Amino acid sequence: VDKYTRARNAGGKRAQDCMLLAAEGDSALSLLRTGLTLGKSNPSGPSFDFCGMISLGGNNKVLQGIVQVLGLDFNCHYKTQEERAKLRYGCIVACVDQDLDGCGKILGLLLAYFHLFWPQLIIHGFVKRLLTPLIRVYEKGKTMPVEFYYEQEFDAWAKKQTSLANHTVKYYKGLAAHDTHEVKSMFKHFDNMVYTFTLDDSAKELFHIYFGGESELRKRELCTGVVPLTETQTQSIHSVRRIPCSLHLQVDTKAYKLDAIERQIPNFLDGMTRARRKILAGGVKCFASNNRERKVFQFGGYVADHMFYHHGDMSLNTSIIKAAQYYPGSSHLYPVFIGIGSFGSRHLGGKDAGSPRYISVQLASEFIKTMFPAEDSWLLPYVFEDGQRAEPEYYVPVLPLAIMEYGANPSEGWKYTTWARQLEDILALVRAYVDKDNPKHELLHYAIKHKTILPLRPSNYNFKGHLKRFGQYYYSYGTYVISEQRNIITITELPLRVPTVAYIESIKKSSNRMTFIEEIIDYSSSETIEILVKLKPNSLNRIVEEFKETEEQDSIENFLRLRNCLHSHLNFVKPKGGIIEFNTYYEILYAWLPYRRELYQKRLMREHAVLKLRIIMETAIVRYINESAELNLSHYEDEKEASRILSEHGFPPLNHTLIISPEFASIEELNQKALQGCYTYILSLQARELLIAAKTRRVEKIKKMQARLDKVEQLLQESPFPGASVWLEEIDAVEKAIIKGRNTQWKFH
Amino acid sequence: VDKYTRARNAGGKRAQDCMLLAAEGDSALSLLRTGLTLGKSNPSGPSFDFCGMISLGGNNKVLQGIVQVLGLDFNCHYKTQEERAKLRYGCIVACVDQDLDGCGKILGLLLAYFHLFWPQLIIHGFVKRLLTPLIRVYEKGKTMPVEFYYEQEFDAWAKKQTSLANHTVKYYKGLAAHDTHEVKSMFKHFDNMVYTFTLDDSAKELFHIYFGGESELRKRELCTGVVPLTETQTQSIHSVRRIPCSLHLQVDTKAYKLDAIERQIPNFLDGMTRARRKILAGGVKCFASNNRERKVFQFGGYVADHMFYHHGDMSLNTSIIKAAQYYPGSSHLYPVFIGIGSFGSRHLGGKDAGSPRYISVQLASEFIKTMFPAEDSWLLPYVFEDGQRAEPEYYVPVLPLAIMEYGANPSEGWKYTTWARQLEDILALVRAYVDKDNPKHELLHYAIKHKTILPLRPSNYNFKGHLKRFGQYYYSYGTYVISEQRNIITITELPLRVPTVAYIESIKKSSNRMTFIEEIIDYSSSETIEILVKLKPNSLNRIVEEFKETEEQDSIENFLRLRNCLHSHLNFVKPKGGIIEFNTYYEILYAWLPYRRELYQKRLMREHAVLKLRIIMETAIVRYINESAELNLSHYEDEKEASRILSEHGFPPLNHTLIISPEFASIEELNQKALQGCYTYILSLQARELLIAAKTRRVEKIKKMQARLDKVEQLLQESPFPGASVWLEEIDAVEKAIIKGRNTQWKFH
Predict the structure, then answer these.
(1) Nearest Cβ partner of A30 from B48, B342, B521?
(2) Do A243 and A198 form a contact (C-beta atoms < 8 A)?
(3) With the C-alpha atoms ordered A225, A226, A232, A233, is the resulting torsion angle positive or negative?
(4) CA end-to-end span of chain B, whole Å?
(5) Which terminus of chain A has a lower count of CB atoms within 10 Å, N or C?
(6) What structural domains and CATH numbers belong to chain B?
């Protein structure tokens, strides 16, 4: 009875005709109230005579709320027609958003709830949804648009079209996006919009997996991607208006389950989540003209406007602030921004940063120009947020960046914990893989059979303690000095990633050792540690007898808790989709190596093709320079006549815009679109560089481009793989930028 | 003992030398820890030997926390030197932000707390603050900047300068904005930065007013503006490093008290708060090139980036949504945006809007182009957020917009409630004031002596009920029909601004009238009301005997609560600063009328001056066209030589950039800057329009501009005030845009 509008004929004699429109949220209910009492404007349509509304967004108080209005009995089983004819409504029709959230959450729980208790209602048809168009394309002529209920049904349409300069493509992911014209239009044919769920005897196991525990089988299920619906499946759905449970659950609620765990766990190619990749791409795009200081809320507003960030601002502001912190033992070891201001210190974990009204930010632009090179950002797959081009799917850096900066996730949802690796020990291994004159190039012999002779040990940069390997795990230690005059113990270095004030409180709470120490003061600097622990008198002789001299840990380093264990949970997201757990750090590096050399081969192949057709166009223009006298265009002022004349004298037609600036185009689109254009690389000249003193320029340009094409053709013939000698120069420029940044305190003066 | 670092010599024998740096927040404490243990890099500076730190997170647990570390006794009075020499520190030194918040809140409460209990400590000097530069200007040459502690001390500096093309002006409103170089630089001279508070025997009454109740005297105090410090006062403060309590409280904590009540109460010129004025100016700036659709979070990100909005996004998103709702009885009656989507309905108060990920927005551009005309946005005073030009101080519309759209504030902080006024009754009164042939132009005879013959009654648009005046107040009524067959009462119209679902719950809670009715169902449309109240049998004869037939209210309209009283609290903000309460709606209109005609006079005077110097420049160029033959500049290729030659032949030097585009410049800046420039309106020609076929163009342009100057000179000589005939045409275009919008449901097709 909460937000429930009762139908007129509900519970009476014609209660087998009624529907119960079950909307999620509260704006969907406003759309339904607009559509149901639409009036005399459509006589053949629904109304409140046979439709009632109830809200959702609640085994809770809400799922016991539709039971009270349908008259459902838990003890019944509803097998025959006369036994399920004592319900107060004919069916339920769900009204959810077309986005990742509504069809994953509300429909998924409602179907699982009906399958758990009354599975004979999904059979014979009682749970229905209604689906509203996703994409509408509007012509500049006619008023009735062309509508698509799935995105693949739009991709199969617009691929077969001409230039879409007269069409407006418009996406509708939520029910609050439909205008009054088109919400009036959807309630013309309300009955051609209601689909029915069915069972297929695989839904038993699939409802067992995704809902109701069994986390082992969910971890076995979410390892692969989200395979979208094929063409014959969508045609078979539209033919009979019946959708199976297993297709909707596999496609439309696996995708929610993967969307929820992809904003916590980072991709393993670049080490970023989705929001951090938005921040990096918006920072590359923002600071490209002038590298001027922007404040943090202004750069956050830029990223929200231009990279389509729709999850609040305080998450965005703390992600902008968190990335640019450079204290000892921070999350980023190679930050992508420069923190002009006060971004917090090591003592309370970066939580004492300034307000984002006051602090500023700017790019690194010597690190970020060299780690993520700009001529490979045109070869990466991108995401599309409602038809507009946002951030890429994944960057591929030069050096394996998922194991270089160490960070965890600040939640107890999913397990993820990375400790950094030695830069001097990843560079030796990468340059053993790439270079052929590097004497340890038998790495290939044990990159397959795992026979590993080069090491990867943890970072120990910005760390004055010790790291020791005890059997299987590494341990970090702190340092201390003892004054045997006035018995103050001075703590000078805590172990890795341990903030100071939480350490002080952890000594405060342990009462078995608070009964020895008297007073404790933190006189530390902003980046070093100096803690005085003043002990009670006659204490040092008996704390040795309480806390024993173990070989792994002496008497003081368990008295003051100066030992840390480096547990490491390596759970990552695949590029195509899924979840992968790795179990050593060698495997993350091995996976990274295959992907990067294919970007070297792709961008060299792309450059080779573009140089081919640049040379073709410039040779054609020089040939027009030679015999320009035999073309009296002064009386050929009609464009089609000069076009037909130039078609006779062997000149090729060229799409000159796509030759000058190939913008995110692939190799095959360059091959099949650059030869279909007009003759406006000749018939659009200034007639100012047509003389002799500019022909030498174009002959020299052809000379430079031909030499560069010979250079690219000898780069693609190398050993061990194409583009190898390009990638060593990139490694050297990266490590010079990192070395120039480490001895400037990452300010780059 | 909460976040307290004990000074090293505190409480001992040299405890008269120590300081207690009391920082607000937690980033200030990181700055102080960076500065105190700065090391051997300055030997003559503070350290932890004689300085301790304590935080001020917030008569509480924190103000009893500095008592415990200073050793303050409530019963003592601390009059003589030997009685205040038993404290554990020498003084307290406050470290607060230079912004509106820190110096208003934390210093204000700390000074009031010390004045309430130990007033003999402010005398003889115990409460000190620390002053950090506000503005630094950096030269492209030298490295040491020029520093300013007050803003007036910067305005008196930069006014006396030359062109600031080699200086970078940089503002520091918060303590987290100081870089490493300059936080190291401020701790060189730490002792030239600590100022001491003193009493002046007016602070007794001023501490009595602002702190500790007495809201009557605060309402009497905040009626005027915030008069900033004069030059001789700041020089007298810097001479002896003593600041009075009364100057800091009057200037720096009145300003916080006015900043807090200026984001709730709107200005009376335009009817907007500060955030809504940011949204309007950013919407005018965003949708100016192409009036496309932008989603609400993208337009919010634009306003945060370009108009300097620093108060979160959900306040901004709900203000963008409330600025475009157009249901019956909404806040805006003339919304400034067009709501492409679903922005909520009248039934639950417009709080059932869509998510701002999905809904879109665009400008009105026929209303907003005519109410706020674009050639007066260059004559309004603006605000400056850290040296950059944000939103104006106040718009001045055409029609008095504070009394046309009715809205309240959704809080119990300050009283503000406006009910709209009849458009047909404000237009008659404004056009009686402006026009001289309008026969009721004796409005001037009783705009002074208040003798009022034209009325202002409430709106009754989008309202099907009744409005009746009973003595002093207006009352709104609802409608109903009674079926004497099956005793359902059908409610068809609720009174003004009353949402439906809250009305239903208000009938549900009253148990003395729920004992008669038994069902109540809501079959309303999106914009009309239809509620069925199904009563128990034999009920209608006795509800007449419970609820009497008063002349003001019959038996049904107090049974169903269909009567509303129109209380109206008219509290507004002045343009200069302050709080004004008005007590009728005539007075708001009278105040608005004087301001608008001075903008007509200002923009006509501005246009007159610009046309004068445009005619001067174009006449000079035509004179150069005449005798261009007598200037052989072919061997005068040196620019200074041709400049000195053109200075001889009567040609005036003109700043041509400021003549072509006068950008926010006043009349006197046009008069004293347009005559000091170079001769590059002649010596920068294309030499393509120098021939005969372009001289006719410039002679015709001089003809048009001379006719327009005669038109402006006869507009400034009118009656009753200059620019009167310009303002009637604006009223007619406004009311045609409003009439074109009311019968399109404010979609403007």
Answers:
(1) B342
(2) yes
(3) positive
(4) 67
(5) C
(6) 4-132+172-260 (3.40.50.670), 466-565 (3.30.1360.40), 593-715 (1.10.268.10)
